[PDB]
Design a protein around this ligand. Sequence first.
Ligand SMILES: [K+]
Ligand SMILES: [K+]
Ligand SMILES: [K+]
Lengths: 551, 1457
Amino acid sequence: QLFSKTPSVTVFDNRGLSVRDIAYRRHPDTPKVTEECITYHQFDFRGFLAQSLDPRLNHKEVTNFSYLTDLNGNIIYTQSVDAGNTLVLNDTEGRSVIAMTNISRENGKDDLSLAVTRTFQYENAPLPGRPLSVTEQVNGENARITEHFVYAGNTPQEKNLNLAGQCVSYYDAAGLIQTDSVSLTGKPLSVSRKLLKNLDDTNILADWQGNDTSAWNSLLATEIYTTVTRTDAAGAVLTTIDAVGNQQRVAFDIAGQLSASWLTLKGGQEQVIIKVLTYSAAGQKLREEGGNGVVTTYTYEAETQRLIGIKTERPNGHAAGAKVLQDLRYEYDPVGNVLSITNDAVPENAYRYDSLYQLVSASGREVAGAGQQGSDLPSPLVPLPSDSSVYTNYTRTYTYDSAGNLMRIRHSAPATNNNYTLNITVSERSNRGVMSSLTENPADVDALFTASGSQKCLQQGQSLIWTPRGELRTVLLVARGETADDSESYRYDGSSQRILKISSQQTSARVQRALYLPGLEWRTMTGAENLQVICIGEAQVRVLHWESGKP
Amino acid sequence: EMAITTLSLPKGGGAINGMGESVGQAGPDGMVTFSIPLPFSAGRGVAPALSLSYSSGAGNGPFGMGWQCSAMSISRRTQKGVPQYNEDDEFLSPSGEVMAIALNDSGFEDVRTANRLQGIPLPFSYKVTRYQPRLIQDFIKIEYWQPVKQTDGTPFWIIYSPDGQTHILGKNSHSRVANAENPSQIASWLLEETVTPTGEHIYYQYSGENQVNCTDAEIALHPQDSAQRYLARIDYGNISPQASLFVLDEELPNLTQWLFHLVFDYGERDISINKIPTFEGGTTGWLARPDMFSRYDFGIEIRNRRLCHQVLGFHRLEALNDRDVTDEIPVLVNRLTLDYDLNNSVSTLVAVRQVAYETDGSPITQPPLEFDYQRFDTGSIPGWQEMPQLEAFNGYQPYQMIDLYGEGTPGILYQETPGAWWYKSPQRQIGGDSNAVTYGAMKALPKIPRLEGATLMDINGDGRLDWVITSAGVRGFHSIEWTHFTPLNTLPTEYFHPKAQLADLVGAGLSDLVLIGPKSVRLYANQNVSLPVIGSRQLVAFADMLGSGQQHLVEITADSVKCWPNMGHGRFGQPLTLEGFSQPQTSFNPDRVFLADIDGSGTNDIIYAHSECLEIYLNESGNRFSKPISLLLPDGVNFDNTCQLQAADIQGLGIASLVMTVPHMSPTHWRCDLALNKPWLLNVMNNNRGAETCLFYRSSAQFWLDEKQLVEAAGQQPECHLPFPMHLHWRSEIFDEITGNRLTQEQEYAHGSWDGQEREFRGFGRLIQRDTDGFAQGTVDIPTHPSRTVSWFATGIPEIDTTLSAEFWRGDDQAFSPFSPRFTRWEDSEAGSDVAFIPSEHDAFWLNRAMKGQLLRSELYGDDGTPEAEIPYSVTEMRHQVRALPTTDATVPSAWCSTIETRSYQYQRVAADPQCSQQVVIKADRYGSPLLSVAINYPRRKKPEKSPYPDDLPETLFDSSYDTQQQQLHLTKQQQNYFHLTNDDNWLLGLPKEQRNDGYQYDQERAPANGFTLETLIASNSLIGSNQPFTYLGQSRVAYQGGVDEQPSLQALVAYGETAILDEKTLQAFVGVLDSKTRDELLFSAGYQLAPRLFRVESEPDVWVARQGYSEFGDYSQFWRPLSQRSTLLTGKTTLKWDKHYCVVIETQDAAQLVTQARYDYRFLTPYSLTDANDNQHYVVLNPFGEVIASRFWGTEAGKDAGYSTPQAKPFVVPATIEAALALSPGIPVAHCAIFEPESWMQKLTQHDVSERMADNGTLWNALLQARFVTEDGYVCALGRRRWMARHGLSVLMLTLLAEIPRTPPHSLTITTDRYDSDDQQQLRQRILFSDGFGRLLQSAQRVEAGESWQRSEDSSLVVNVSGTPALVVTDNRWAVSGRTEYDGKGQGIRVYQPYFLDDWRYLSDDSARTDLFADTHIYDPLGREYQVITAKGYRRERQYTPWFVVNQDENDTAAN
Ligand SMILES: [K+]
Ligand SMILES: [K+]
Ligand SMILES: [K+]
């Protein structure tokens, strides 16, 4: 009813180009008011995209995006109000050769004072021009070679391991990944990670100079983290032995779908994680029984294949008694927005959306009185509630602008009087926005970000440091000038995936380390707990194995 | 971009299609065409590209009525006079166009002397003359090669194709059709050899007609029989590379020097699939067809006795595998069998089928492609019915049913006073059947003159004396005027000035001429060997008794029928006897003999009238007569000399009906129509995979009556330009036997054009086509409405073409005025240009003719009853230019037609605000290549005061749909040049050279009110002129090697391609970021380089370009094959190593020394084995159709061997049936194996079952097999079944049996193994892919774990309880069915089903699916665009297309309300 005359419209020029995206925003509270939201796209003399403007900023004469291309429409230069200005270029082989980022402006011209220049180097002729190295250079600083690739040859030794033409050695920001063995099906059977020495010091950075692996291996810590895989004839992974020797095993059904999984801790016997798993005709999980005897049953809508039921239960005849642990029931609008959720064990979450399918109202329950939502988790309610009066109902309202920026979350918990409003202050010349506690002035929001658009302050006393690639480097939790700070740092692999997390708190010093490996989290706590977290599935089931400090 | 060669095993399997056969799109000629590409190998790449093709306008031949499978040829002109083998003879291009001796560039007759050709010295001297056709299509170069000394040898033809190919026609006697009495008198030169710049050859060997398997009577009747040729064998994949034609050598290469053969069998081999055809023919000799026929177009007899029964592919596998060639016999690869409905009148091609062979010799078959035709049926002859249209006549009043005006349908000619002749034109009867004919108001004949006993007269008029009038006379003692009217075309051309035998026949001249049928005329006289004497109890007449297309001489007595062949120019040949006709000498009366084509065979049949009976003797292909058909008169009628009877095509169908008037009998007027449709026309196709197309013809004459009715109702005057009936593609019904859905395509024709001056069919001026969906559901659940496309084509006649634009839709007052044809003269000294001119009347005839068949306009409508239904979705119109080209003929210019302008409007059924684009070819070179062209995008029209779009939209959308970018006039200029190699005796045109594009943008105010034309664009004040500012868009260049500099040689080897990336304007992307030096060294490092700007003006700066696509090639001895490839110079080369005869590449080595090796199955030249860069083996097994039916792989892992057992170690036999394959046990040494079942839609029938049901010990089985009701391997053929039923019926026992027998859509089974065969945990995954009769993916079934599913019955429906609810069962034979789709006739997914479980892999019926399974329905518009979706839940999504915006409404948007 709220959606009458709210279509999506695309408006064209005379050369088949989409120059306008038109939406129609209508709030259920004010169903007589319909906002026509228009996104503008301007194309140049060559038929390529030159400018894009959201409905909000267009009114204020600011351009969300500007592009400058080559004669074929490939973007070379970009101006973003959110991501700042950037410059990229590819070669004649289609390979990326340069990317300059974190550029702003002010004085009119582009500010390169903090520009990050990443360049890509490839094998030269007569080689097939495979990726050779990746160099990263921040303005005013020295260039670091952050990546290097080494490829195997044609020797019988290499062929027997199926390594010919494969990148056998990958030096990234964290250290080294070696590919030891490849399946007949072209899959890796053995990979080994070595860490760069002293990654605990945030000032030590990878820099693979030259073309000698001997000189590099000396920079690596001694430990070798080897993950071993065994795949089936169709190239699917059957067994996995992690770096500490635990095995995950899977089995597939006649249709090749995961049908069972097992775990064999090092020195232990094989045990069931997933006993049986059935699927719908559409290949969606239907019934899943685990090693704990617990059964999850998924209910789907026949017309739409939408998930309308999730039932986790201890079934009849279970050793610990039959009990429905969770029974989620979903009700959707014709388009597929979640209108309501129920759980059997009366509790109900109701949802209202605008004509753009933005969530404007949400009802639910919380342990009241919690207090105003922040970065913290609530204190855990221990033990498990027997009575539900321990919960109170809340209603939240959400307020968005023309560019989809969430400006307001109004929390209303009347009975316990736990009422508050989280305000987000949005810039008037970008989509940059921060909580009002940082600033309530739109004109000061952009300074709180980098030129790339990465936030520099999390909360009031908390600052954010970023890598040249725009990866989160350090969260400064409690600053103490000089020089003992509560902080948490991060490290990433060449694919920008997190490999290491180091938290530090003053008490000598509580240091919590997290090493992320295939199917494994290696977490140490000092100031000593040595925890190995086996991750099963892809992560669904987790196993906590202490080598030391089991509470 | 250049493709880099990568060795891979055939990675496919699943889908099932056919040979790529297709019905032709309906065109302005109205003919039904069909085409089947020959399913044989392309060899190295140079191969015969033959298609077996059908045309409803074609005659009989070596592939049956209407079919042909021939290569290019050059013949003498016959259509405007019979050739006499003198210098006045004319020659036709392979396109059928008349040629003239061409002029050279110096302005003289292009004649030369030659003693050398292609570097090969000729034994003697030749006079070489260049010929040029009146219409240029492909700029081919045609040379006539005549020995200077006539006795030195025979002449032949050379055709240089613009692709650099050279073709020689009729060099030796097998490739020449020549006079049986004088081999020098050549009628036709057939293609004999083709050579390409790569030194690859194709040789065409023909067999001459002979007396093998002919009866003695046939031999006696046709001694001159050696003329005709039949395609016998095609040799390709020549082992020796040679740039020059082999026919120029002293001797042709041995037969062993061709890797590939295509053999044509004419019956000498066993037709059985159980007998494998050998490369060697004989000694049984080719069979003689029952319907032998002669043609006499060339003034010589050509006898035709042979039919092609098999087409065969042969490879020299030993030679291709580089094994010992000694005593090699080429092996059969693919076999195409052809079934004919053999008939003494007309034999029809009724089936083509692929058959191939396993190593064990077992036949593996494809489903047959079947055809059937409209047939004359004596049992379905309509009886007599009264003819009320003659009610006004007393019953003694004489009349003649004749097409007086030339409308294709005869009207009523009579004498009213007497002395006064009046005519009633045929007209569409009102209210009656769609083809019912009445006759309009009388109209006075012009003053009839009457003199030399017979005089000419113009009636229509035309200015053409089209009518020969005679008068009966005179006996006895009776004073008396009653005349006879005879169409001039029923007489030999040389009737009034007879020479030879005609003069010997007529003498002083004939006394009288009396029509005895539509095109047969009885002769009445004054009072070598061996003409009849006109004036006994005999009949002498002119009639086509031979079906050859001429008015022959015929004598009929009580016991004889003799025919003398009209050989042209007054010459008549030796008499032919046609047995079969007899009447007692005591009752035989010549007056009671009528000559007409009754069965539409082409031959004139005999109709003899008795007092109570009419006997009809069908003419069997001019050889004899059938046993007579007895037509009883209506009860009470006794035919005598006071009664009136005539044979006339009163239906306008090209076949004679009978009009009888019997006084003293009421009613007095009677009709007998013997057929309602023209027989021998293809009307059904079925591929036995689920697709059937039914065809429907309608005469051009009926169409003319309808058109004339509409014209007369519109106050205008009807003018017919089509004087005879043509059978036009009227309707196609495309039927999906699996879903039961149909698509109807309907055609209407108007403005029919036949040219009297050149005696030539020009075609139709307007063609309207309706497309209507017809769903088996038979509800309105998919509410589609028919689409309508109105198209206008040029006829080449101004009197017709000038009236077409008036019919154009005029609902858009702002639309630009219609295009007009542009005529130019060519000025190539030395770049060339077209100069517009107004041709003389005489020149205008030919230059206008050049526009024959060109599409002028097209409008697309949706007939959905909406208010906007009369406004087209889109309109497209074209402007054509004819370049006049002078030859040695001073009176006929040669011509080249091209589409110089195209304009498209997108209205989307809103007349006021369309989009408009226009493409214009401004300059073309001497060979038709575009030099200067422009694409134009017009601005949007000015915003109106009110919205022309629905008020269902938001009220602001109209205003907000306007954007300034819609107001900018865009013109995109495109320049290009070419390399043309025409020096010496080579001919290679249109080689890519340079191209450049520039942009022009203007304000709406500068847009011309009447729009752009070519003249507007070459004008000095052009918007794209040299003065105007522009935006450089880029350029492209091709550089060649070896090669003068970077220019091409005949081999056209590309060195690299070079395209512009950056110029001074785009370089501004670097400004605030990098300085010039840094930018330049970056670009240089990234592989870019500076090159001159092409088509440079005013010192334009060089542009940064990218060069890609580098190849190194071998020499002539390696057939110029690529030896190395690389994308740019930034990387290393990949090396190619070819096999022995350079057919395929067997090894690649990239730039890191990685080596990939392949081994090929040489019956398909596809790889079957692959060794990868890590020395791993990959292996496939191919079935006899090149399909992968098993695959495995092995090699090493961690030193140890893995995983699948080698074929040597553990052979695997793929189960012969799916039932067996499903029942396989683990431990199979294959990763995949496949079973293909493309014939599963044909019901399976065994000899045993039929014989057990009929208890006839095999009788019915043997008969059904013989007629191909069923194939030898036991598949029931659809059309064979229908034909059989139509001729013999079928026992109810067989009906019962067949009802017990299930069908299943064409499908494939693919089994995929989980582990290597050494692993006992191995599972066999099972996936079955379904295809429909159109090659579309029907559904996919995957074997899943046991569980709950619906239950499929044997009848393919769902098992439901009594109430109708589907049963739910638990089974271990459960399948997950995904992607189930119900298509319409256009291949669009009308129903996409949710996945479902079933207790069988077999196809669940569409009835049960539509009733019980959830699906989203998709509704498409006439443009094939989805505009509505009804979800299973019942919600709707809609999409509205307007020229300037698309509106999208989802489930929420439409739910209200
Ligand atoms: K909406
Ligand atoms: K290997
Ligand atoms: K006939």
